[PDB]
């Protein structure tokens, strides 16, 4: 059981640039290979035997190392690179792997779109209560989101689901959600999202408020 | 070609068993060792077990050890891997693979996957929930709007919304996982002269409960 460490676990391309990821070994191996997946799909074979470039793949795609250290090459990428890569060794069973690089496709600052949305009347017949925060459209990835209840900032009961990469325009999106009882939602009155972004000169914040309309 | 798919997969209860098939077509399958991988849903692969060319040799991962068991059919080019007392890190799409050569340890070939879930929850429908703004005047060329998911299982869920606009923007949010049921969100972006004067709905498909359910997206 030889542990491979794969660096870095994600980055970011512009299609032209090179792109190299390490693959580091517990203990000397004998032959490394290297796989690409994107989602939804099952993974193919790039490089076999530490070196040798598999049958049909782009010849941009390149493979050394020896010893405990392993790295593969992309001369000049392309926009179809985009993926995660895993480093497989072997040495003697077990067959083992990287965690894997996520190559992510470099794109041009974006700011997110930022909408909040009260629960509707259906969700508060059964008794809870969901305000839902959208922040869409935006890059790079990292960006942080801030709850107020009334002016108050809350964090316990929110949970936050991000998009892949769009295939389309290369964002990302997030989704926000608060989720309250309907009997602690109508006892507060102003609910505020408050997106932080790079590009942000200010935070975003969206807000409604229960009796005003 | 060569071609390998996979087949068996499902829900199974926790403890419970589960016999996975693999059929193989185009190359002579009798000549070639094969493998079985995994890959639980967001994360990375593993490698779970191997057999020779004529099942002489065996080798297993260690986690799956004294209860899987690979085993093949020359004849009738099929692979099987028999997995019992089965539990929730078992949950994996799982992958039959082979090399280009007799029995070398690497995965030239690989068959699309068959999902194996592990778990106790019982077959739900979701709940939906139409999301539209709260009351006040808009702005903008836009408007964004969206359903919420809730408490639906197992995952396969299929969101699709009807708009007045080819120029849409959709987004599918990945689903959450809580007290044994899913929870997602989906949202759609139409031009501002499209809604409220033109319906929007978005229609929730649950296969494995053989449900759908529309909702229509109502201003204040």
């Known amino acids: 059981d030889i542990v491979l460490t794969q660096s870095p676990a994600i980055m970011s391309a512009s299609p032209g640039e090179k792109v190299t990821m390490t693959c580091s070994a517990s203990s000397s191996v004998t032959y490394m290979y290297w796989y690409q997946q994107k989602p939804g799909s099952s993974p193919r074979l790039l490089i076999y035997?530490?070196?040798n470039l598999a049958s049909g793949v782009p010849v941009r795609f390149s493979g050394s190392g020896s010893g405990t250290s392993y790295s593969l090459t992309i001369s000049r990428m392309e926009a179809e690179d985009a993926a995660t890569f895993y480093c497989?060794?072997?040495?003697?069973?077990?067959?083992?792997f990287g965690a894997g690089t996520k190559l992510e496709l470099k794109r041009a600052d974006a700011a997110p779109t930022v909408s909040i949305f009260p629960p509707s009347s259906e969700q508060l017949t059964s008794g809870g209560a969901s305000v839902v925060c959208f922040l869409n459209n935006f890059y790079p990835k990292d960006i942080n989101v801030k709850w107020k209840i009334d002016g108050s900032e809350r964090q316990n009961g929110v949970l936050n689901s991000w998009t892949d990469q769009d295939s389309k325009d290369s964002t990302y999106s997030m989704s926000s959600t608060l989720t309250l009882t309907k009997d602690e939602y109508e006892r507060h009155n102003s609910y505020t999202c408050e997106a932080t972004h790079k590009t942000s000169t200010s935070p975003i914040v969206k807000s409604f408020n229960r009796n005003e309309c | 070609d060569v071609q390998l798919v996979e087949s068996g997969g499902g829900l199974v209860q926790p403890g419970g068993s589960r016999k996975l098939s693999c059929a193989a077509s185009?190359?002579?399958?009798?000549?070639?060792?094969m493998h079985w991988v995994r890959q639980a849903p967001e994360k990375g692969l593993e490698w779970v077990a191997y057999i020779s060319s004529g099942s002489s040799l065996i080798y297993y991962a260690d986690t799956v050890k004294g209860r899987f068991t690979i085993s093949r059919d020359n004849p009738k080019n099929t692979l099987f891997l028999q997995m019992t007392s089965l539990r929730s890190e078992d949950t994996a799409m799982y992958f039959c693979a082979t090399s280009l050569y007799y029995g070398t340890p690497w995965f030239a070939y690989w068959g699309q996957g068959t999902l194996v879930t592990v778990s106790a929850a019982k077959t739900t429908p979701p709940s939906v929930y139409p999301l539209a703004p709260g009351c006040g005047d808009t702005t903008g060329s836009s408007v964004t709007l969206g359903c919420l998911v809730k408490g639906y299982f197992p995952e396969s869920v299929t969101v699709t919304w009807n708009s007045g606009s080819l120029s849409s923007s959709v987004h599918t949010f990945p689903a959450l996982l809580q007290s044994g049921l899913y929870t997602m969100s989906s949202s759609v972006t139409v031009p501002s002269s499209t809604w409220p004067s033109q319906t929007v709905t978005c229609s929730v498909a649950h296969p494995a409960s053989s449900t759908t359910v529309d909702k229509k997206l109502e201003p204040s």
């Open positions: 185009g190359f002579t399958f009798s000549g070639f060792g």
């Open positions: 035997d530490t070196s």
């Open positions: 497989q060794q072997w040495s003697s069973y077990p067959l083992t």
